[PDB]
Amino acid sequence: STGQHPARYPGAAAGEPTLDSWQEPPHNRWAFAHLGEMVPSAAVSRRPGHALARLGAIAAQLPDLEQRLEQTYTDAFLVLRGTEVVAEYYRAGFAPDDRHLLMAVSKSLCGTVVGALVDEGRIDPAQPVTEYVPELAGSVYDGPSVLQVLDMQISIDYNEDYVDPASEVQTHDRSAGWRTRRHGDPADTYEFLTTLRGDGSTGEFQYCSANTDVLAWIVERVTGLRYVEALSTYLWAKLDADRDATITVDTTGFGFANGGVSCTARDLARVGRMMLDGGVAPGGRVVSEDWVRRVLAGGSHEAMTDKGFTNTFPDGSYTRQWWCTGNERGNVSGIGIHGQNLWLDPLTDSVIVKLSSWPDPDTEHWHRLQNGILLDVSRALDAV
Amino acid sequence: STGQHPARYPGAAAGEPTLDSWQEPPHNRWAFAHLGEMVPSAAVSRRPGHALARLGAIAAQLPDLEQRLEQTYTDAFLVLRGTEVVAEYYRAGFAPDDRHLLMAVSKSLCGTVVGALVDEGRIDPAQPVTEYVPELAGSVYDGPSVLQVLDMQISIDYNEDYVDPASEVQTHDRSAGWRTRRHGDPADTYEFLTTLRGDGSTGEFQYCSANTDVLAWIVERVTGLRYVEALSTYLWAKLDADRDATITVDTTGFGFANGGVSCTARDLARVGRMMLDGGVAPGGRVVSEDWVRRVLAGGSHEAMTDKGFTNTFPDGSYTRQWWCTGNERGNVSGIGIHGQNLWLDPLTDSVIVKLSSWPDPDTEHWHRLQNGILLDVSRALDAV
Ligand SMILES: NCCCCCC(=O)O
Ligand SMILES: NCCCCCC(=O)O
Ligand code: NA
Ligand code: NA
């Protein structure tokens, strides 16, 4: 029993519709207008072959930039300095307005939605997760605070080894529809989360994608809105974005908050712009000045024991779904496997978006190359 | 063995990627930019409750029109007289730019793509299906001509009883991903089509959705393009449409040509405009003047023995994926279950689009009400 969840549509029964009932009334009225949410679908282009490189000024400072982008399997790259796009790159086959999977950069967007609700006083990070999701009692989420979920400081028996077929990460994917279901798997993401356990210890950073989905669940319970709608209402609809974003959903219509969002590079940059603007977007304030300040300030350094991060960023940390480098530039970034970054460079009031498709999800090699590019581009923006 | 099929992406192996391999290289580069084709996904609106009724002039002639539209579960309704939108209606909850499933109206779009290839001489309707799809040898499609598929004049052991769980129509849905798979089901739509049989007779009309998917298969073999791309290249991209259309795809990426297309009402009207313009669209000629003339002329009346159609349209017929009323106005229409119509009224140079969600897929009751509305609106457009 996972309790009350936002109906797929007004008046919809729990879990309706399913792949086998969407053609039946009363579900069909909603389904006929949102079939992509039920069945895999392709776009039939309204528009009738080569990479687009417009690395503007930074090109002079970084002559081999395009080659470096190709070497890191770059699909879309965009640099926003202030309110101006000063550099752009799109691989052959990927249009400037095409959307790209954000993977874990999605987490930073979810944390933003949580921050908005904290500002409204609908969520108190000091409160235990169970204050909002009682059904998580008896699980590893029984005891920890919402802030500990936000900062990922909960010890959990969860193997985030993507390529490993036995890990909890694969089960998470199967429960959400990212992979084929196996007999006995949890029915949906909510159920999967309730199966998680840990030794009860907290305080130390442990990257776990389940944490973000718990945040999305909390968002749904406090607002009564499907996470998909909450993500739009509290964030996307206030960005004056060029295109809607998309998010994969499981069989109940629950969005894969931890990593299923897709959007254009230019629109993702609008999220960064909002962060550098103290939490304000064209459509209104998204989060408070305080929330943004706390994100830029970083999390507890002592909690950050991930050498995969500290080897490059010794004074790094993590807080509210954002990775904080703690470097001399105060860089903070949303990160997603296979090379996704929503990189903030407050010094130059710039945002760097890099959406890629490395063959591997996470290796020292790829991160070394990628971070080298992000840091070089950031420095190229400094006054000289 | 169903032979060669267009790769999901350049260089992709047969059937790749699958739900279990899209995160792996080299598939991920394509998948990260088209995840909706692999996993059900929802739109995250970039925009921040009541029906919109703008029945313009025809309102005076049809005072109870809005109520009649509500009674027929109308989601979107649009009347294009010449090049001008003279009447519009959208139910509460459905925006003017929202897309709606077309069901079998999709068939008329597929027939249009076939017509384009006939004009190019890449398809000869007189040729047997096996001339283009040899793998269909041994099936009910071994012997009939492409034109017989176009006109649906092939006797097939296929129960098109949607609500019936044992029918071939349900198996068709499961093979394409519209319903949950059962153990033993064909792997994809191509395989399903090869399992179809019949007594060998032809000449009499038999509405069968499998026919359209065979047409789409032929389209792929003659062009080398995924049907999804062919639908864009030969039709959608030439309409100067406001939005892309979408089409559900099966596990191989094959579009559900017989009924999985979704688009806005205004854009669907552009297809009708093209038909009334002799086959020409803003982006170029879609089909020949001759093809359009043949569609408007109708098919063999003797072949049309469907009382569900002839009771209302005694001189009606069917040809090239279009229903021809044979009425005094020469009305022709694309039709899809649950109330979808792309209705052509050549007399007034008008197109009527009605996208609905009747609780039932097909009953005399709903068709009586729906046709009454389409005919009344058509007559309201006559000069007086
Ligand atoms: N389990 C699917 C991948 C989720 C995203 C994880 C990440 O980007 O770190
Ligand atoms: N088997 C799914 C429905 C296909 C559309 C059929 C029709 O609209 O006539
Ligand atoms: Na806040
Ligand atoms: Na033609």
mmCIF file of C-alpha atoms in Angstrom, chain A residues 88-243:
data_model
loop_
_atom_site.group_PDB
_atom_site.id
_atom_site.type_symbol
_atom_site.label_atom_id
_atom_site.label_comp_id
_atom_site.label_asym_id
_atom_site.label_seq_id
_atom_site.Cartn_x
_atom_site.Cartn_y
_atom_site.Cartn_z
ATOM 1 C CA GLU A 88 26.592 27.110 -29.520
ATOM 2 C CA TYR A 89 27.305 23.673 -30.943
ATOM 3 C CA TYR A 90 25.033 20.884 -32.170
ATOM 4 C CA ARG A 91 26.253 17.605 -33.649
ATOM 5 C CA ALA A 92 25.209 16.519 -37.114
ATOM 6 C CA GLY A 93 21.734 15.029 -36.806
ATOM 7 C CA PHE A 94 20.762 17.033 -33.723
ATOM 8 C CA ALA A 95 18.821 20.246 -34.341
ATOM 9 C CA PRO A 96 19.136 23.319 -32.062
ATOM 10 C CA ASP A 97 15.502 22.895 -31.000
ATOM 11 C CA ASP A 98 15.692 19.126 -30.537
ATOM 12 C CA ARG A 99 15.233 17.823 -26.996
ATOM 13 C CA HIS A 100 17.821 15.726 -25.169
ATOM 14 C CA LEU A 101 17.565 13.404 -22.163
ATOM 15 C CA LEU A 102 18.940 15.112 -19.058
ATOM 16 C CA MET A 103 19.550 11.998 -16.967
ATOM 17 C CA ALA A 104 20.399 13.158 -13.407
ATOM 18 C CA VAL A 105 20.373 16.844 -14.344
ATOM 19 C CA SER A 106 16.665 16.064 -13.836
ATOM 20 C CA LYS A 107 17.431 15.812 -10.109
ATOM 21 C CA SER A 108 18.407 19.476 -9.898
ATOM 22 C CA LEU A 109 15.070 20.378 -11.480
ATOM 23 C CA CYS A 110 13.216 18.256 -8.915
ATOM 24 C CA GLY A 111 15.135 19.877 -6.072
ATOM 25 C CA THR A 112 14.062 23.236 -7.464
ATOM 26 C CA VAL A 113 10.399 22.213 -7.270
ATOM 27 C CA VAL A 114 10.968 21.136 -3.671
ATOM 28 C CA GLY A 115 12.596 24.486 -2.954
ATOM 29 C CA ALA A 116 9.560 26.311 -4.319
ATOM 30 C CA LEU A 117 7.297 24.420 -1.919
ATOM 31 C CA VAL A 118 9.669 25.135 0.960
ATOM 32 C CA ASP A 119 9.273 28.839 0.198
ATOM 33 C CA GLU A 120 5.497 28.398 0.339
ATOM 34 C CA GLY A 121 5.897 26.672 3.685
ATOM 35 C CA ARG A 122 4.280 23.496 2.365
ATOM 36 C CA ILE A 123 7.485 21.560 2.999
ATOM 37 C CA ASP A 124 9.754 21.805 6.041
ATOM 38 C CA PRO A 125 13.117 20.134 5.271
ATOM 39 C CA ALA A 126 13.617 19.512 8.996
ATOM 40 C CA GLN A 127 10.571 17.234 9.053
ATOM 41 C CA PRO A 128 10.916 13.469 8.580
ATOM 42 C CA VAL A 129 9.959 12.056 5.178
ATOM 43 C CA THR A 130 7.135 10.162 6.910
ATOM 44 C CA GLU A 131 5.460 13.460 7.824
ATOM 45 C CA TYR A 132 4.544 13.711 4.145
ATOM 46 C CA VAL A 133 4.696 10.073 3.032
ATOM 47 C CA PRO A 134 3.545 7.923 5.992
ATOM 48 C CA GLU A 135 3.581 4.881 3.709
ATOM 49 C CA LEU A 136 7.383 4.999 3.734
ATOM 50 C CA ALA A 137 7.314 3.888 7.360
ATOM 51 C CA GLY A 138 9.281 0.671 7.773
ATOM 52 C CA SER A 139 11.673 1.537 4.949
ATOM 53 C CA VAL A 140 15.082 3.211 4.884
ATOM 54 C CA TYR A 141 13.160 6.479 4.526
ATOM 55 C CA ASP A 142 11.578 6.000 7.950
ATOM 56 C CA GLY A 143 13.571 8.330 10.191
ATOM 57 C CA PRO A 144 15.585 10.585 7.830
ATOM 58 C CA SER A 145 14.557 14.197 7.248
ATOM 59 C CA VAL A 146 13.502 15.677 3.914
ATOM 60 C CA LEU A 147 16.744 17.663 3.963
ATOM 61 C CA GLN A 148 18.740 14.449 4.304
ATOM 62 C CA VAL A 149 16.963 13.200 1.177
ATOM 63 C CA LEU A 150 17.691 16.528 -0.533
ATOM 64 C CA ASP A 151 21.384 16.262 0.383
ATOM 65 C CA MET A 152 21.504 12.497 -0.210
ATOM 66 C CA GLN A 153 22.904 11.793 3.241
ATOM 67 C CA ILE A 154 21.128 8.498 3.895
ATOM 68 C CA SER A 155 22.835 5.100 3.992
ATOM 69 C CA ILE A 156 20.943 2.807 1.621
ATOM 70 C CA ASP A 157 21.400 -0.757 0.397
ATOM 71 C CA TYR A 158 21.143 0.299 -3.260
ATOM 72 C CA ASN A 159 23.695 -0.497 -5.961
ATOM 73 C CA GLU A 160 23.723 2.436 -8.402
ATOM 74 C CA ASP A 161 25.749 0.308 -10.843
ATOM 75 C CA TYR A 162 23.813 1.005 -14.045
ATOM 76 C CA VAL A 163 25.477 -1.654 -16.219
ATOM 77 C CA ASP A 164 25.028 -4.249 -13.452
ATOM 78 C CA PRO A 165 21.933 -6.452 -14.147
ATOM 79 C CA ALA A 166 21.491 -7.438 -10.485
ATOM 80 C CA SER A 167 21.648 -3.987 -8.866
ATOM 81 C CA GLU A 168 18.791 -2.057 -7.258
ATOM 82 C CA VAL A 169 19.367 0.503 -9.997
ATOM 83 C CA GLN A 170 18.187 -2.002 -12.616
ATOM 84 C CA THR A 171 15.159 -2.869 -10.503
ATOM 85 C CA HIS A 172 14.458 0.861 -10.221
ATOM 86 C CA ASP A 173 14.528 1.076 -14.032
ATOM 87 C CA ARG A 174 12.219 -1.920 -14.439
ATOM 88 C CA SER A 175 9.758 -0.558 -11.874
ATOM 89 C CA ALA A 176 9.595 2.737 -13.796
ATOM 90 C CA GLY A 177 9.442 1.339 -17.324
ATOM 91 C CA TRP A 178 12.973 2.180 -18.469
ATOM 92 C CA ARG A 179 13.683 -1.548 -18.825
ATOM 93 C CA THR A 180 11.576 -4.666 -19.411
ATOM 94 C CA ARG A 181 9.767 -5.907 -16.291
ATOM 95 C CA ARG A 182 10.736 -9.184 -14.628
ATOM 96 C CA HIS A 183 8.256 -11.418 -12.827
ATOM 97 C CA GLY A 184 7.904 -10.253 -9.234
ATOM 98 C CA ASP A 185 9.080 -6.664 -9.766
ATOM 99 C CA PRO A 186 7.401 -3.825 -7.866
ATOM 100 C CA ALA A 187 4.289 -2.637 -9.730
ATOM 101 C CA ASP A 188 5.477 0.962 -9.927
ATOM 102 C CA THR A 189 8.071 3.406 -8.614
ATOM 103 C CA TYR A 190 6.186 4.084 -5.364
ATOM 104 C CA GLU A 191 6.175 0.392 -4.491
ATOM 105 C CA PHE A 192 9.860 0.061 -5.371
ATOM 106 C CA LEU A 193 10.808 2.882 -3.007
ATOM 107 C CA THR A 194 9.032 1.161 -0.102
ATOM 108 C CA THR A 195 11.245 -1.913 -0.591
ATOM 109 C CA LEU A 196 14.456 -0.001 0.120
ATOM 110 C CA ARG A 197 16.366 -0.628 3.343
ATOM 111 C CA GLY A 198 19.543 0.605 5.024
ATOM 112 C CA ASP A 199 21.451 0.288 8.304
ATOM 113 C CA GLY A 200 19.807 3.437 9.640
ATOM 114 C CA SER A 201 22.897 5.643 9.586
ATOM 115 C CA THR A 202 22.781 9.123 8.050
ATOM 116 C CA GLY A 203 25.079 12.103 7.590
ATOM 117 C CA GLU A 204 27.352 10.715 4.891
ATOM 118 C CA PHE A 205 26.760 11.431 1.211
ATOM 119 C CA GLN A 206 25.541 8.476 -0.837
ATOM 120 C CA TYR A 207 24.408 9.220 -4.365
ATOM 121 C CA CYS A 208 21.154 7.305 -4.844
ATOM 122 C CA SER A 209 18.568 8.046 -7.536
ATOM 123 C CA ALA A 210 15.794 6.683 -5.324
ATOM 124 C CA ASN A 211 16.175 9.785 -3.143
ATOM 125 C CA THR A 212 14.937 12.083 -5.890
ATOM 126 C CA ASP A 213 11.864 9.988 -6.606
ATOM 127 C CA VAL A 214 11.061 10.171 -2.887
ATOM 128 C CA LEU A 215 11.254 13.954 -3.237
ATOM 129 C CA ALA A 216 8.846 13.830 -6.173
ATOM 130 C CA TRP A 217 6.500 11.647 -4.108
ATOM 131 C CA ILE A 218 6.614 14.235 -1.311
ATOM 132 C CA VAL A 219 5.848 16.937 -3.876
ATOM 133 C CA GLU A 220 2.744 15.030 -4.989
ATOM 134 C CA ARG A 221 1.450 14.503 -1.451
ATOM 135 C CA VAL A 222 1.872 18.162 -0.482
ATOM 136 C CA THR A 223 0.370 19.607 -3.686
ATOM 137 C CA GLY A 224 -2.032 16.938 -4.903
ATOM 138 C CA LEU A 225 -0.535 17.389 -8.373
ATOM 139 C CA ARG A 226 1.048 14.698 -10.538
ATOM 140 C CA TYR A 227 4.798 15.321 -10.416
ATOM 141 C CA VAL A 228 4.633 16.006 -14.167
ATOM 142 C CA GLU A 229 2.230 18.884 -13.518
ATOM 143 C CA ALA A 230 4.122 20.116 -10.452
ATOM 144 C CA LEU A 231 7.333 20.311 -12.493
ATOM 145 C CA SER A 232 5.516 22.547 -14.987
ATOM 146 C CA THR A 233 3.597 24.702 -12.513
ATOM 147 C CA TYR A 234 6.474 25.347 -10.122
ATOM 148 C CA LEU A 235 9.276 25.533 -12.672
ATOM 149 C CA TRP A 236 8.898 24.957 -16.400
ATOM 150 C CA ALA A 237 5.918 27.249 -17.012
ATOM 151 C CA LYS A 238 7.750 30.180 -15.404
ATOM 152 C CA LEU A 239 10.849 29.968 -17.623
ATOM 153 C CA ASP A 240 9.338 31.382 -20.833
ATOM 154 C CA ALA A 241 10.788 28.280 -22.492
ATOM 155 C CA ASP A 242 10.712 27.755 -26.259
ATOM 156 C CA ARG A 243 9.361 24.223 -25.949
#
